[PDB]
């Protein structure tokens, strides 16, 4: 029951068995005893490194601003960002370099990220806006139908006066500004938690599923339902980026486990509403934006539900090219008047 309620503690005995188990129960030795799961901070998800492996140069520590590198390693080829780096109002104000991986679980080289894309420090308000929009859009609006008194023909059988209706339900409209902001903040949150992995290509030797499973096993990708899921952003590679997905990998990624491939973009189309005043009566579907966001986009809900985030260098290049003009327009005038000067 409620905490401040008399019905909260009237079960004063019997909830526990006096005799303990002989296989799993044990006694508390003392302060030097390490209890399984004990932690001072409230962790509703007590996942640790071994259970949920993080892939990053360093374990995220309070001393380090971000768990990735801060300077290019002299023993690895360094690849600068495709578009020049600008630090905006929300950027981390620090250089970020990710150790790109190969399909053989080996670090190939190190590629610099973008602080505007992977440096926008996350914020709970925007993350919650994204999550709420996604969870209110993904619900099925065609199943919200209910009877009415004029629809019931001869109280119990007589329907309600104002029942729920597919058209009466609401589908909200979200602006591309907040959408891109929330997606960038989610990418930065993944980077800070240290579960972002950059691969050169996502290509299978055969379009079947056993080759996909063999690839995941070789590079230690946990795909099971119970284990930590995977979120792919396939875009091709660095030299040959493609907006569409690779055909072989797109055919092979259909596994029952927790793995989802999404389109390599963080923006969205501007949602329109041509039935704002309920002009067309025979329209079926919820009021609001008639052009919702498809499922194969990057989103806070799927990013939280899937443990690891594997982005491709083609996706990186496409995101940078799509956010270049935005991060250039956001700049104040006394800064943007110097862009042609610096080149």
């Amino acid at each position: 029951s409620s905490i401040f309620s008399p019905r909260y503690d009237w079960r004063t005995s019997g909830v526990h068995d006096i005799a303990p188990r002989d296989e799993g129960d044990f006694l508390y030795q003392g302060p030097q005893h390490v209890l399984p799961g004990a932690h001072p901070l409230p962790l509703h998800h007590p996942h640790n490194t071994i259970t949920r492996p993080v892939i990053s140069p360093y374990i995220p520590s309070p001393q380090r601003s971000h768990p990735y590198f801060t300077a290019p390693l002299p023993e690895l080829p360094h690849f600068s960002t495709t578009k020049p780096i600008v630090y905006t109002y929300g950027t981390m104000k620090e250089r970020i370099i990710a150790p790109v991986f190969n399909l053989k679980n080996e670090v190939i080289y190190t590629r610099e990220l973008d602080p505007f894309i992977f440096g926008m420090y996350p914020e709970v308000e925007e993350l919650s806006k994204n999550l709420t929009y996604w969870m209110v859009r993904c619900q099925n609006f065609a199943s919200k139908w209910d009877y009415e008194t004029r629809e019931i023909w001869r109280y119990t059988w007589g329907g309600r006066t104002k029942p729920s209706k597919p058209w009466n339900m609401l589908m909200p409209t979200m602006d591309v500004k907040t959408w891109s902001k929330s997606n960038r903040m989610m990418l930065t949150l993944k980077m800070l938690q240290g579960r972002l992995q950059v691969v050169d290509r996502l290509t299978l030797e055969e379009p079947t599923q056993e080759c996909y499973l063999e690839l995941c096993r070789n590079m230690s990708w946990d795909v099971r339902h119970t284990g930590g899921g995977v979120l792919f952003m396939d875009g091709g590679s660095r030299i040959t980026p493609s907006s569409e997905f690779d055909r072989a990998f797109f055919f092979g990624s259909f596994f029952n486990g927790r793995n989802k491939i999404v389109r390599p973009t963080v923006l969205c189309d501007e949602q329109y509403d041509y039935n704002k005043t309920a002009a067309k009566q025979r329209m079926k579907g919820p009021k609001g934006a008639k052009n919702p966001i498809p499922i194969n986009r990057f989103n806070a809900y799927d990013a939280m539900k899937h443990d690891r985030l594997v982005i491709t260098e083609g996706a990186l290049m496409q995101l940078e090219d799509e956010l270049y003009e935005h991060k250039l327009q956001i700049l104040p005038p006394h800064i943007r008047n110097q862009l042609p000067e610096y080149g």
């Binding site: 004029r150 023909w153 009566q281």
Partner: peptide
Amino acid sequence: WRTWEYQHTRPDPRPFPD
């Protein structure tokens, strides 16, 4: 009469025949 509230479906005749 509010005819615009309804959609265009023919209601079943009452009483229904066998």
